[PDB]
Amino acid sequence: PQQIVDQVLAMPEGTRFLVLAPVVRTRKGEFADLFDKLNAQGYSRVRVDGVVHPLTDPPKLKKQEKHDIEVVVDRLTVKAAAKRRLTDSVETALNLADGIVVLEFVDEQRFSEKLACPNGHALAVDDLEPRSFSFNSPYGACPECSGLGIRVPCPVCAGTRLKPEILAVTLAGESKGEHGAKSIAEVCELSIADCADFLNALTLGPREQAIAGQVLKEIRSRLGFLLDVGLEYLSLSRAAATLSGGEAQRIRLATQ
Amino acid sequence: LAAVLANRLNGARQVPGRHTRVTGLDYLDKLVRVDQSPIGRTPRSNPATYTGVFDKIRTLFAATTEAKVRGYQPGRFSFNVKGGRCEACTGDGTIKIEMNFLPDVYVPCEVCQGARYNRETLEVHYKGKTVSEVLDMSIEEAAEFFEPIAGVHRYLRTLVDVGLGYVRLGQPAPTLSGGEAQRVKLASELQKRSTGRTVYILDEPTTGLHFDDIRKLLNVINGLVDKGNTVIVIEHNLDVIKTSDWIIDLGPEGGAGGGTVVAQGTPEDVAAVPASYTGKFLAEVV
Amino acid sequence: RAGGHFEVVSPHAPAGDQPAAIDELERRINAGERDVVLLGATGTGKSATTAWLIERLQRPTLVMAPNKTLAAQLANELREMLPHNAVEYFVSYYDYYQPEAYIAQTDTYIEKDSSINDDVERLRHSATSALLSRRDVVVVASVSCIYGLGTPQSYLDRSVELKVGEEVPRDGLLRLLVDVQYTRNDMSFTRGSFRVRGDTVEIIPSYEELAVRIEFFGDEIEALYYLHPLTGEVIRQVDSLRIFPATHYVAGPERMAHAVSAIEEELAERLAELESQGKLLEAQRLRMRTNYDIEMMRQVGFCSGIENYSRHIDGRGPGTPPATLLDYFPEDFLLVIDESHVTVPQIGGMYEGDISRKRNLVEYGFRLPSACDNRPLTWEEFADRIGQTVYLSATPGPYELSQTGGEFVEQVIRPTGLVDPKVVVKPTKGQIDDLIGEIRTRADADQRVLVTTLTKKMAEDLTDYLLEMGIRVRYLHSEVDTLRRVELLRQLRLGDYDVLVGINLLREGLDLPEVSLVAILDADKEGFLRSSRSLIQTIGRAARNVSGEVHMYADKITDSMREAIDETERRRAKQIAYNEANGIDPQPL
Ligand SMILES: [Zn+2]
Ligand SMILES: [Zn+2]
Ligand SMILES: [Zn+2]
Fold it and tell me: Which residues, by range, are in coiled-coil regions (chain B)?
C-alpha cells in the first residue's frame, strides 16, 4: 500500500484525479442499503459503474444491472504536501476498497497493489525463492512425470529434468562468468569444471555477493578437494549411476 | 504440601499424595509456586506486555496532542496491532524469511530501521520521544524516565530494585534466560499487594541466577517477608538457607531413607542437630 | 446576549388574585426591591406568575429550587407556555456521588466515586451556551450552581463559529474542536464527539442533542447541515453556527498555564502547611495525586479533581466566591427562589458541611485550599452576586422576611374557587374509635384519608392495630422507597385503600385530591419538624378536596397550629366570598 499512496508523485503534478475506493468491485446488486451504510459512516461521495454521484443523492440500482461500486472518497488533484488528506482517504480505501484505488486522468494511472506479478499475473516461480526450482519438491515437478523425468521422457521435460515454466523463464538471468544466461537445466548440463569455472568469477549484484559468499566458499572448497582427488570430468547432470564406487568414495574423502 | 495448599487455597484439583491432614491454612490466603520456567516462549510477548506497563505507555503516548488530533486508541500505538504493524514485518522491526536448512539473518525494514513500528504512528513524539524510542530505552532508562507518572513508576521501581533492568524493554521473551524470567515473575508478584498473607514455594533457583542475581532475589524475598510473606524453597545453597530465617530439613537418608523431619528451626537450630547433612553444613558454617 | 421576546402562549385566562399580584410584583421589581416575598397558597400557580414576570422583564432568569425532584415537573410545563425561547436545566449530574471524603479517626479515604448522569450534564451545557449566546434564557438550578465553576468569559471565548462559504482550515477546525473538548471519534458517533472522513466532518455537540455534517471545499467551509446523529437525516441547513466547549472547565492554553502556576504555588503552600501539621502521610498523598493531575494537565488538560483548582483556573483569589452560573448570568439577570425558606438554610448548611469536608480534605492533605475555594458561595457571597431577589412561598422564611422588611405580595385565592378545609381539634384520647369510624364513613363513598405521627414505634404499632381491625391502612417510615408509595398511588386511584400513616417524609411528594379528611397526631409538642410551616403544609394538603377537613388530636393546642387554622379559615371565608361574588361554586380543576 505504501507504493499505492506514493504513486501520487508518479502521476504528473496538478493533474486531476479521483479518490476512488473500489469497495465492491463490479459485484452488481441493488445496494441502497449499502449507500445508507456508507452515509452512516459519512463520505458524501461515491461512483458506480464508473460514474460519480453523491452518497447524499445516489442513483437507483437493480440486481440485474451491473454496478461497479468504486465509491468516490475525496475531491483531490495532484497537489503538493496533500499527504494528510491523501492518506486519510487512502488507507480508508485500502480497507473499504480492500487495498485498491485509482487516480485516473480525469483532467492513465491505477493505484493498485497486486501480489506475485505486479500486474496480478501468474508466475513460473511465485517469487525469487530457490525451492521454486526444486522438482524433487512439487515446485518443479512436472504434471506428467512428478520429477522422475519420464512419461520416453514426459512431454513437459523434453530433456530438462524440470518444469518448462521453471526452466528458464523466471531464471534465465544467471550471469555466471561471461555471456551468462542459464536455465536450471543449463547449469545441470554444466559439467563439474564448467559450472565451477562459471562460478569462479561472476557479477550478479552486491546483495547477491553478500548472500551467496558462503555459496562460493563451499563450492570452491568442494572443488579444491575434488581436484585434490582428480575428479572433474563428471558433469552436474551426469547420471548418478555413473558412480563407480570409487567415485562416491572420493566424494566422501573430499568431504571428510 | 504444595498439592494440598494449592487445592485448599488456590482451588487446585491435583492429587494430595498421602497425608492425613494439614493445618495453618487459616493464617494464609493463597499460595504461589515459582520456578525457573521461562515467562514467554514467543517474541510476541515482551517485558512491557508481561509487566502490564505496555498499555500504560500506550495511553501515555495517546496523551500527546498529536495523538488527540489523530484520535486513535492506545492499541493503535501497540506493536502487536494489525493497523500499526508495517506489513513488511508485521511491525516486527526486521524482515524474516527462511527455510529449514539454515537460520535466517536480521534485516532492517524500510518502514522500521529496527523501529518495529510504522512511521505513521511514530510521528507522535510524546515527551520528545517516539514510540520506537520509548520501547527502545531499556528498563533502567525508562525508570529514570516517567518520573511523575505512577503505575509505570511502580513497575520500573520494582525492576530497578531487581537490578536487572539492563534488559531491553522490547527484548523477546525467548531471548531471556529462565532465571531472568524468574526475576520477572517475582517482580510481577512484588506488585500485587498480597499483604504478605500469601506464601511462596520455590525450586532450587541457583540456575539462571549468578551470585549477585541470587542476592537481588534474596533482597526481593526479604522485602516480601517483611511485607508478611511466607516462603519455602528447596535449595542446595548454604547461603540461601542460612539467609532464610527458618529451616525445615527433611530426610534422614536419601531416597526412601528420608521422609521425615530430621531437624528444623532457625538455620542455626537445624545446624545444631546433625540429623541433616545440610544441617552439618550449616553448622560448620557460622 | 440576544434576547428573543418571551412569547407566552397561555390559553388559561388569569383571574382572581393573578392580575393584582403580577402588577404589584412588577412594580416591586421596578422599585429596585432587591428583597421581595410572595405568599403563594396551594393551587395559586407560581409557575405561570413567574413565567409572566420573566416575560415582562425580558431578563435571563435563574430559578432556584432545593431538590432535583421539584425541577423536573415545572421546567417541562413552562416550555409549553414558552415554545419560542431558551428554556434550560441544571442540577447535579450524578446518578450517584460519594464525595472525596476522609474519616480522620480511621484514616480512611472514601474516594470520590460517581455514577454520572448524561442528560443532566447535557442540559447544563445547553444552559451555559444559551446564557452566553442569548438573553432570553431561563435556567432551573439546584444549589450546585453556587459551587465552584469555570469562567463564562472563557466559556464564550473558546466557543467558535463557522459559516458557509467562509474559508477555514479544516485542520485548524479539528484543533479548536480538541481545544473545546471534542474528541475525534473516528470509530463511532457519540455525544460531544465527531469523525472526519475526507473533507466531510460529522459532530455531535455536547449540549446540542442532534449532530451536524459539514462539507469542506479544500480548506473552505463548503456547507453546514443539521443531522440526526446516527441515521444522519438532515434536519435542515443553516449557513452558520457556533460551538461551545463540551466542558464547563473551559480555559485557554494561557488559562491552563496560569492555573498550573497558581496550582504549584498553592501546592507549595499546602506542602508546608501539612509538613508543619505533621500530617506527612496526607501531604505526600496529596502531593503525588496532584503531581499526576498536573502531569496530565501539561499533557492533556483533562482529569478528575479539576474543580479543586478553580481558584487557579478562574484565577480569582482564595476565599472569594468561585465562578458560578450567576456569572454566566448578566448583572441584570432575573432571579427567583422558590422555597427559599429551605434553599437559603440549605445554602448555609451545605457550605458548612462541605467546608467541614474540605476540612479532612485540604486540612488533611487531599487537595489544596483551592478545593475549599471550589465551594458553594458563602451565603453572603451569594447574596452579593445575586441581583434582585424574589422569594416564593406561602410560608416566607424568617431571614427572608428580615431581608424584605416583612412585606410581601399575596396570591392565595385560586381562580378556580377552591376553599380551605374545615378544621377540628380534639384531645389525644378517643383516637382509635373515631379513626375507625371516619374510615368507615369515607369508605361508604370510597374516599381517602391521611394520618400523621411522631414516633416510629407508635406509628407502626398503630398501623398494625388498624390492620388488625380490618382497615385498608398503610404506613410510612424514615427511609421508605419509591415503589411503596407509587403502588399506593396506583391503589388509591383504583380505590383499594383509604388511609395512610406517616410521620415526617409524608409531608413531601404527595398530591391527593381525593382526601377530604386528615388527622394530625400529638401536635401539642413544640417541634421543629412540626412547626407553623408543618401545620400550614397539612392545611394545604387538606385543602385539596372540595370539602376537605383537618382533625388535629392533641391534649393541648400549640400557638402555631391554631393561629394557622384561624388565618386559614378567614382566608377560606374570603375565597368563598370571592366565589359567590363570581356566582361560581368552588370549581375543581
Ligand atoms: Zn505478469
Ligand atoms: Zn517432466
Ligand atoms: Zn518493517
Answer: none
User: Smallest CA–CA separation between C186 and chain B, in Å?
Assistant: 7
- Parallel, antiparallel, or unpaired for β C160-163 and C240-243? antiparallel
C-alpha A140 – ligand 2 centre gap (Å): 9
Residues of chain A contacting C202 with CB distance shorter than 8 Å: 42
Same domain for B193 and B116, yes or no, is no
DSSP C240-260: EEEE--S-SS---HHHHHHHH
DSSP label at residue B174: G
CA angle A167/A171/A175 to nearest 5° reads 125
The DSSP secondary-structure symbol of A196 reads H
Please tell me whether residues B232 and B148 are part of one structural domain.
Answer: no
C-alpha cell at B198: 500469601
- CA C198–ligand 3 middle distance (angstroms): 28
Domain residue limits at B50? 38-176
Question: Quick check: C198 and A84 CB within 8 A?
Answer: no
Same-domain pairing of B159 and B195: no
Nearest to B99 among A1, A87, A131 (CB): A131
**Phi, psi dihedrals of residue C334, rounded to the nearest 5°:** -70, 145
CATH number at residue B62: 1.20.1580.10
Helix (H, G, I), strand (E, B) or coil at C378: coil
Q: Taking CA atoms, what residue in B is nearest to C193?
A: B71
Report the distance separating Cα C456 and Cα C233, nearest Å. 57
The answer to whether residue C304 neighbours chain B at the CB level (below 8 Å) is: no
Which residue among A39, A41, A74 places its CB closest to the CB of C199?
A: A74
Query: Is B9 exposed, middle or buried (CB count within 10 Å of its CB: 0-12, 13-18, 19+)?
Result: middle
**Torsion angle (degrees, nearest 10) of CA B122, B123, B127, B129:** 40
Phi, psi dihedral angles at C409 (to 5 degrees): -130, 125
- Alpha helices, DSSP H only, in C379-481? 379-385, 398-404, 432-445, 456-468
Tally of structural domains, chain B: 2
Fold of domain A109-243: ABC transporter ATPase like fold (1.20.1580)
Which residue, B265, B267, B259, B212, is CA-closest to B238?
Answer: B267
C565 Ramachandran zone, left/alpha/beta (phi>0; psi -120 to 50): alpha
At A191, list the grid cell.
559439467
For residue C189, the distance in angstroms to the closest alpha carbon of chain A comes to 9
* Pairwise CA distance, residues C555 & C430, whole Å: 11
What is the grid cell recorded at A186? 543449463
Q: At A215, list the grid cell.
A: 555459496
Chain B residues within 8 A of A2 when measuring between CB atoms: 110-111
Tell me the CA distances in angstroms from C30 to C1, C25, C27, C36, one per residue in order: 22, 8, 5, 12
Closest CA to C29 of C4, C1, C52: C52
Q: Which residues of A touch C218 (CB under 8 A)?
A: 75
Residues B58 and B151 grouped into a single domain = yes
B160 and B207 belong to one structural domain = no
* Domain co-membership, B219 together with B254: yes
Q: Which three cell numbers stand for residue C412?
A: 392565595
Same structural domain, B149 and B266: no
Return d(Cα C153, Cα C159) in angstroms, integer: 10
CA of C301 to the centre of ligand 3 (A): 34
Q: What is the CATH number of the domain that holds B278?
A: 3.40.50.300
**Angle, alpha carbons B33-B38-B39 (nearest 5°):** 80
As assigned by CATH, the class of the A1-108 domain is alpha beta
> Residue B126's closest chain C neighbor by CA?
C299
Element of type H or E holding C172: helix C170-179
| Residue contact B111–A87, C-beta within 8 A | no
Q: Per the annotation, where are the binding residues of C for ATP?
A: 40-47
Residues found in chain B: 286
User: Is there a single domain that holds both residue B45 and residue B31?
Assistant: no
Write the residue in C196, C215, C232 that is nearest to A40 by C-beta.
Answer: C232
